[PDB]
Amino acid sequence: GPSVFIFPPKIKDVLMISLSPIVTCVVVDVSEDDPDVQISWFVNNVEVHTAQTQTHREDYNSTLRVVSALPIQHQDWMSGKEFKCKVNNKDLPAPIERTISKPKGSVRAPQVYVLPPPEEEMTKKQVTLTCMVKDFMPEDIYVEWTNNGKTELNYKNTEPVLDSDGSYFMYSKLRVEKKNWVERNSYSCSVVHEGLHNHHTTKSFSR
Amino acid sequence: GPSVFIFPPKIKDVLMISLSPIVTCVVVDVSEDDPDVQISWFVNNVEVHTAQTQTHREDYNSTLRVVSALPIQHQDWMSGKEFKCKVNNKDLPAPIERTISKPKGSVRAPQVYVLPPPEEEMTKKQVTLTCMVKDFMPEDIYVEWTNNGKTELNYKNTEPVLDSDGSYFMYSKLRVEKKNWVERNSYSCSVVHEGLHNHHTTKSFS
Ligand SMILES: *[C@@H]1O[C@H](CO[C@@H]2O[C@@H](C)[C@@H](O)[C@@H](O)[C@@H]2O)[C@@H](O[C@@H]2O[C@H](CO)[C@@H](O[C@@H]3O[C@H](CO[C@H]4O[C@H](CO)[C@@H](O)[C@H](O)[C@@H]4O[C@@H]4O[C@H](CO)[C@@H](O[C@@H]5O[C@H](CO)[C@H](O)[C@H](O)[C@H]5O)[C@H](O)[C@H]4NC(C)=O)[C@@H](O)[C@H](O[C@H]4O[C@H](CO)[C@@H](O)[C@H](O)[C@@H]4O[C@@H]4O[C@H](CO)[C@@H](O)[C@H](O)[C@H]4NC(C)=O)[C@@H]3O)[C@H](O)[C@H]2NC(C)=O)[C@H](O)[C@H]1NC(C)=O
Ligand SMILES: *[C@@H]1O[C@H](CO[C@@H]2O[C@@H](C)[C@@H](O)[C@@H](O)[C@@H]2O)[C@@H](O[C@@H]2O[C@H](CO)[C@@H](O[C@@H]3O[C@H](CO[C@H]4O[C@H](CO)[C@@H](O)[C@H](O)[C@@H]4O[C@@H]4O[C@H](CO)[C@@H](O[C@@H]5O[C@H](CO)[C@H](O)[C@H](O)[C@H]5O)[C@H](O)[C@H]4NC(C)=O)[C@@H](O)[C@H](O[C@H]4O[C@H](CO)[C@@H](O)[C@H](O)[C@@H]4O[C@@H]4O[C@H](CO)[C@@H](O)[C@H](O)[C@H]4NC(C)=O)[C@@H]3O)[C@H](O)[C@H]2NC(C)=O)[C@H](O)[C@H]1NC(C)=O
């Protein structure tokens, strides 16, 4: 029969009041001969009727996939309410129910540092700027590099790693032209995390 | 019936000639009522007879698990030969065969840099050293920090990340006593990868 997966909102979406967090319930292995799936949503066991649901074909193996997106209030996530999807179908011996909520635990703001290129790289045409983000809990975080406020082109993030004390760390690596680095630059690391004031902080090499 | 999974050697083991790389074949859902499975191993379709096999109980669900560990020659893995386990038993309708080999692809040696602590930490008793390992392919790598050659305790590695040019990078973070680092400079980053000369390099602060 079908299988159901449940997915949280993106951390940036739930921490920035201007964005639209969504909880998503995905039904896979739905039969082409029985596409009708009934999906019911609950918030702390109260049924709600606001989800947007769409069906598509998975050509890889001739099955259907149903995607149900529930728009949520930021504060319902942050306050630890439980979101539940209940999936019914003729091809199921019982409804499938999946639940998700913001895990309850310690909160510690990240310490953010920007590191210059290693000295040995300074003979190269392109150099590497590193943003160290550490000591944070929970692991959910959003990190980007920006230049003059514009979300940067060539950076890449590591995933968070569990440190020896139970906090997490990650690094963000930015490649830049050495010319741009030595000349007046505004490269900045920007971090979104629930432990920060206004859920956001930036670090830069200069003002 | 049973299911068979096959696992590669650890990258450090297969790159270091002093270590012992192993290819492992795991049979799950063996019946406690019929524990006997026959496992045969082949390298480039040549049967080999050196594997060590054990059986044990999985009490979670009253099944057995059989683990067969083939000690391999490093060059067989590195040259792209296929390793095959073949699992049989009197009640299977046909044997189950699993194969594994080193993935094909390009090789790029890592560039390794050590980064000092952020200047903000330099007023603290403990500081953070960073080893930046980048531009490598394939993603299989081993990275550690050492202190006067002794493998260090308090470091943690990121996993590799796919970079914009199809190569990989990672970082390794080590916490040290500041006094000790500024005085003795005893900490170095050691990297084991296919692309390096002797499959190894070490990087120190200058
Ligand atoms: C038929 O084919 C399909 C398709 O196959 C795939 O695609 C084709 C083209 C081929 O390439 C093929 O090789 C591929 O496999 C098969 O469908 C797949 O079925 C398997 C199940 O068999 C599914 O596997 C689960 O995947 C989960 C992860 O899914 C995400 O990530 C993968 C990539 O890593 C994506 O492919 C998926 O689409 C998912 O992506 C996420 O989707 C979210 C929802 O949209 C996104 O979030 C939303 O994003 C929007 C913006 O877009 C907004 O931001 C919203 O706010 C937000 O909500 C999200 O961004 C996106 N992420 C990414 C990274 O892209 C796994 O989580 C899951 O693992 C769990 O379950 C396993 C049991 O099945 C178990 O073994 C695991 O241990 C794990 O168990 C859980 O563990 C946690 C703890 O960690 C516990 O809490 C739980 O208790 C426990 N739960 C359970 C249930 O056990 C599965 O591995 C796969 O998702 C699915 N793919 C697709 C595309 O649908 C199908 O099976 C084939 N059928 C047959 C019969 O062969
Ligand atoms: C009865 O219960 C048992 C036990 O259950 C478990 O334990 C209990 C207590 C509960 O906690 C329960 O929740 C647990 O599940 C059940 O047994 C399990 O059965 C499932 C299958 O149903 C097995 O799932 C596969 O797992 C593979 C990964 O296994 C490793 O990682 C897990 C942790 O994630 C470990 O638990 C395992 O033990 C494995 O660990 C590895 O073991 C290696 C061998 O020992 C180690 O390597 C060796 O290490 C030594 C040093 O120690 C040397 O270095 C050697 O050199 C070296 O070789 C290795 O270090 C170690 N790793 C880790 C991290 O520990 C998955 O890979 C596999 O996925 C494939 O197959 C799926 C289909 O089954 C498919 O959907 C997946 O997509 C995936 O498919 C593959 O995809 C790739 C591309 O992505 C393709 O290339 C392949 O073609 C494709 N393959 C296939 C076949 O399609 C499975 O998920 C599970 O391992 C097993 N657990 C154990 C412990 O045995 C049992 O099912 C129950 N029975 C019943 C009837 O209920």
Residue A187: which CATH number?
2.60.40.10
Do B29 and B80 lie in a common domain?
yes
**Residues on A contacting B at a C-beta cutoff of 8 Å:** 113-115, 118-121, 128, 130, 132, 134, 154, 156-159, 161-164, 169-171, 173, 175
Q: Where are the alpha helices (DSSP H) in chain A?
A: 11-15, 74-78, 178-182
Sign of the alpha-carbon dihedral angle for B133, B137, B139, B142: negative
Chain B residues with beta carbon closer than 8 angstroms to that of A132: 118, 128, 130, 173
CB B175 within 8 A of CB B126: yes
- For A200, phi then psi, to 5°, come to -160, 140
Tokens of B117: 């602590």
Residue B87's closest CA among B102, B67, B101? B67
Do B150 and B83 lie in a common domain?
no
User: For chain B, percent helix, then strand, then coil, each to nearest 5?
Assistant: 10, 50, 40
From the CA of B124, how many Å to the nearest CA of chain A?
A: 14
Do A137 and A172 lie in a common domain?
yes
Do B139 and B87 lie in a common domain?
no
Do A185 and A112 lie in a common domain?
yes
Tokens of B76: 């067989």
Do A106 and A154 lie in a common domain?
yes
Do B46 and B82 lie in a common domain?
yes
Q: Is the CB of B160 under 6 A from ligand 2?
A: no
Ligand located closest to B26 CA: 2
Q: Is the CB of B103 under 6 A from ligand 2?
A: no
Atom number in ligand 2 closest to CA B26: 44
- The parent domain of residue B176 ranges over 102-206
Query: Ligand 1 centroid to A5 CA: how many Å?
Result: 7
Do B66 and B131 lie in a common domain?
no
CA distance B77 to B81: 6
Do A87 and A121 lie in a common domain?
no
Do B148 and B199 lie in a common domain?
yes
Three-state DSSP at A128 gives strand
CA distance B61 to A189: 49
CA distance B191 to B113: 11
Do A64 and A118 lie in a common domain?
no
Which one of B101, B120, B151 terminates a domain? B101
CB B139 within 8 A of CB A142: no
Three-state DSSP at A9 gives coil
Do B27 and B95 lie in a common domain?
yes
Which one of B80, B101, B122 terminates a domain? B101
For chain A, the domain total comes to 2
Q: What is the 3-state secondary structure (H, E, C) of B168-206?
A: EEEEEEEEEEHHHHHHHCCEEEEEECCCCHHHEEEEECC
Which one of A101, A133, A149 terminates a domain? A101
